[PDB]
């Protein structure tokens, strides 16, 4: 009869066939990941082509239902999600060129192998050949050689490809009634039609700047402390007044600072909280790791794992004969099939990763009642944030004492909390200016604020201004230094990490206030609290049915992303860093004072 009922019937013949095709494709991808064989690659490609062709045919059929004659908000949300053209609005020649460009960037990044000139008989790939050198070497010119040679090869291959990529993506985005591709990426957070809870694409950049302006003093103090410690490690290269040299940050790009924890530890004399030896002494299998994680999730009141989870997951490396991807990934295959693919070792990192991926699994299980096209996070930040809050809670010494992995007579003084908070700041706070600077640079590239001949002069200017990191030697426009990273070279949004980081501590304050924890925020554990799990599950059950602003109202009582919980989390460390930076100089100079 009416258009709305027609759309509802169309959405049911979508949902019911879609769930089954997405299942077939996801199972083919799983069989490829647990069994790397060429026929499994072909089966994966066939299933993916069927899935993409089915999405093309349903997008072609969904647009024939006009949006303004539908009043139900959920139906309008699913129809808005389905009616996006994507790349289909672009011509077939340009679509084929764009797909070819994306594939060849994937091959250049994946198969990029670089070694020293005049010694070409063997070479090292990025993982793990260059990662170990960047994370463990203490030699200035070796790290400088590796950094400059990898940005020389990768940037000089990828610069014309990225110049074609920006033009094609801008053409597709303006063909889709967006201002640029940056507006297309910012449209994930766009909420329209809800009174009070509306969020605009232009409000995202303003909110990101507003939060980062409050991030900036903590990062300035942390940067001053890291500068002083790296001056101790490398005596003459680092200046007291200038920025940090780029190749000394412990990783390839500066994404994380967590490999500088050995050099920048406050109290080396005090012990660590390493629990690896304790699990080795008690012979903890990976099955016991996942059962303890399941015990954590049943303690907070969330549902426990299905029988099919324990039957169908691969929690151990299969062997020499069978090859599998080692990266930990949680799979929501559809139809109540939930699996974790992790090559779990007996380490603290794998235990925390098990908590993180089982948090992903819990988030996927919670919105299983929703319709298929609404089975996602409310935004891209929540899905990672609900795993990172489990990573926060599991890392606490109270959780380790509760499960028996730590001695009950372990002395928790202030020095161990300071160095633990510094490790968490090097992991968490240090990625924030890099993430914000990268997304702002990509937004200015897509918007056309930066011409192609001026990409790098602005980029290093941004890095000195925001990240406080100086280039070792100047780079001309033959280099493509951003696209050496995985996410930018393979067409991925990057603001999800910034939003994840802020949502992580907002959720942490909300659940710790729910759990009536009476101490510091970093000493808080959300186990044994049914009400904290209920407050979590109220947002978890919604999925993508409700706006992310309304979900954030459901958890923390605020209509917008907030920066104050992060600053409250690092407040002991903030006072300690302000005490330690009395003699030294907080802040940096954008001039070439250390080295150029």
């Amino acid at each position: 009869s009416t258009i709305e009922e027609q759309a509802k019937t169309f959405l049911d013949k979508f949902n019911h066939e879609a769930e089954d095709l997405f299942y077939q494709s996801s199972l083919a991808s799983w069989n490829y990941n647990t069994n790397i064989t060429e026929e499994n690659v072909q089966n994966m490609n066939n299933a993916g082509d069927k899935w993409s062709a089915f999405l093309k045919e349903q997008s072609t059929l969904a647009q024939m239902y006009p949006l303004q004659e539908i009043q139900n908000l959920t139906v309008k949300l699913q129809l808005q999600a389905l009616q996006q053209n994507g790349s289909s609005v672009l011509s077939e020649d340009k679509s084929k060129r764009l797909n070819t460009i994306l594939n060849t960037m994937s091959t250049i990044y994946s198969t990029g192998k670089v070694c020293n000139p005049d010694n070409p008989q063997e070479c090292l790939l990025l993982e793990p050949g260059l990662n170990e050198i960047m994370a463990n070497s203490l030699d200035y010119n070796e790290r400088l050689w590796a950094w400059e040679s990898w940005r020389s090869e990768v940037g000089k291959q990828l610069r014309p490809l990225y110049e074609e990529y920006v033009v094609l993506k801008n053409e597709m985005a303006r063909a889709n009634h967006y201002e640029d591709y940056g507006d297309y990426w910012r449209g994930d957070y766009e909420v329209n039609g809800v009174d009070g809870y509306d969020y605009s694409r232009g409000q995202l950049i303003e909110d990101v700047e507003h939060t980062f302006e409050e991030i900036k003093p903590l990062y300035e103090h942390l940067h001053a402390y890291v500068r002083a410690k790296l001056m101790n490690a490398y005596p003459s290269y680092i200046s007291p007044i200038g920025c940090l040299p780029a190749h000394l940050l412990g990783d390839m790009w500066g994404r994380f600072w967590t490999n500088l924890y050995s050099l920048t530890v406050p109290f080396g004399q005090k012990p660590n909280i390493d629990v690896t030896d304790a699990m080795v002494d008690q012979a903890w299998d990976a099955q016991r790791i996942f059962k303890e994680a399941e015990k954590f999730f049943v303690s907070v009141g969330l549902p426990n794992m299905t029988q099919g989870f324990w039957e169908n997951s691969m929690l151990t490396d299969p062997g020499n004969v069978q090859k599998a991807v080692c990266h930990p990934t949680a799979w929501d295959l559809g139809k109540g099939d939930f699996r974790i693919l992790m090559c779990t070792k007996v380490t603290m990192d794998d235990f925390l990763t098990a908590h993180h991926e089982m948090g992903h699994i819990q988030y996927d299980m919670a919105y299983a009642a929703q319709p298929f096209l609404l089975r996602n996070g409310a935004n891209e930040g929540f899905h990672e944030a609900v795993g990172e809050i489990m990573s926060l809670s599991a890392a606490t010494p109270k959780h380790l004492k509760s499960i028996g992995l730590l001695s009950p007579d372990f002395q928790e003084d202030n020095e161990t909390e300071i160095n633990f908070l510094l490790k968490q700041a090097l992991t968490i706070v240090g990625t924030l200016p890099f993430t914000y600077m990268l997304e702002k640079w990509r937004w200015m590239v897509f918007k056309g604020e930066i011409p192609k001949d001026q990409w790098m002069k602005k980029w290093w200017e941004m890095k000195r201004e925001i990240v406080g990191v100086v280039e070792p030697v100047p780079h001309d426009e033959t280099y493509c230094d951003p696209a050496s990273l995985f996410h930018v070279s393979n067409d991925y949004s990057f603001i999800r990490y910034y939003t994840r980081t802020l949502y992580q501590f907002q959720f942490q304050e909300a659940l710790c206030q729910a759990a009536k924890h009476e101490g510091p925020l970093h000493k808080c554990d959300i186990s044994n609290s049914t009400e904290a799990g209920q407050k979590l599950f109220n947002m978890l059950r919604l999925g993508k049915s409700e706006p992310w602003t309304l979900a954030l109202e459901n958890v923390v009582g605020a209509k917008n992303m907030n920066v104050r919980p992060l600053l409250n989390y690092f407040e002991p460390l903030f006072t300690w860093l302000k005490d330690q930076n009395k003699n030294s100089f907080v802040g940096w100079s954008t001039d070439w004072s250390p080295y150029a």
Partner: protein
Amino acid sequence: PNITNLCPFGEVFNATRFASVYAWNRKRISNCVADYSVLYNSASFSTFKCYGVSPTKLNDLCFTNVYADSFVIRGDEVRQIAPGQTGKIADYNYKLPDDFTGCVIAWNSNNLDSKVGGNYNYLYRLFRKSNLKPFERDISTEIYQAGSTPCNGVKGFNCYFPLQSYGFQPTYGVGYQPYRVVVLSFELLHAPATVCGPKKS
């Protein structure tokens, strides 16, 4: 006295293949001895929900006829096989009356009815113009008309095929695994009641 001629419950419960829920099999059981304690004391059934009668007095009472309806549904759809429920199965596939006397017995059959490639031999009517009357069977395969335009027999725009398949696989969740459902309907009519329980000696 000495009792023989047991009711054929082996051809309902232990059938090698079950029907689809749109074309559910109905077997009329008459003039034999129905031993219900064999079913109640079995550990193989997950649901044995009886409506309108209790299982303890089934072995005492006597009925005119027994209707055994057999089909396969999902795990999450077993709750819809009840009086007064609402869903795809209740509205469009199999409708139970509110004044229903009988028992709904369901058990998991992931071992038999699921294959690794996907078992697509089971269907469920997804669309019908009106809800079913109680104990009605619809096996029509006519294209559902959701719009004003005539379908003319072609599955084009707004004209969808009614029957949609279930894709049973053995790696599915417990809410999606196949469940074999047998519904027994007990009625008393003015004819002499002949399906009585066994009498102890």
